[PDB]
Structures are given as structure tokens and as C-alpha cells.
């Protein structure tokens, strides 16, 4: 359960975790639900 996203959005994409958060979250398409909550990447234009 405790694979939630917290401060793991600063060191870089953990490609070796059960749940990941980075700016590359969209790159791998593997980010947690609390990515936007904890990290707040500021998706200006979106896509």
C-alpha cells in the first residue's frame, strides 16, 4: 500500500518502483494518483 507518491518527484523517475512520479510520468505513462497532489507539475498547455 505504501507505494504512494510523496517526495519521489524530485530525485527523478523511479523506473524500479511499484508506483512512480516524475516529469517523465507522461513519458512512461506510469504516475500515481497523488502525483498531481504531491508534485504539482503545473500542466500549462496540457497536450
Structure solved using which method? NMR
How far CA 11 is from CA of 1, 6, 16, 45, in Å, comes to 21, 11, 13, 24
Eight-state DSSP code of residue 36: H
**Rounded Cα gap, residues 14 and 43, in angstroms:** 20
| 33 contacts 3 by C-beta, under 8 angstroms | no
Range of the domain at 40: 1-47
Q: How many domains does the chain have?
A: 1
**Rounded Cα gap, residues 29 and 23, in angstroms:** 10
Amino acid at each position: 500500500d505504501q507505494e504512494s507518491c510523496k517526495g519521489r518527484c524530485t530525485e527523478g523517475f523511479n523506473v524500479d518502483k511499484k508506483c512512480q512520479c516524475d516529469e517523465l510520468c507522461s513519458y512512461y505513462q506510469s504516475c500515481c494518483t497523488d502525483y498531481t497532489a504531491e508534485c504539482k507539475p503545473q500542466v500549462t498547455r496540457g497536450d
